[PDB]
Design brief:
Elements: E1 23-25, E2 28-30
Antiparallel strand pairs: 1-2
């Protein structure tokens, strides 16, 4: 379970789940 870096792509949280360091928003990984 490794988190994605900022600007990374995360597939549909509903289907694949959300995975990001921070938050997965609009299939993007955002931290702040």
């Amino acid at each position: 379970s490794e988190c994605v870096e900022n600007g990374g792509f995360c597939p549909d949280p509903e289907k694949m789940g959300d995975w990001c360091c921070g938050r997965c928003i609009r299939n993007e990984c955002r931290n702040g």
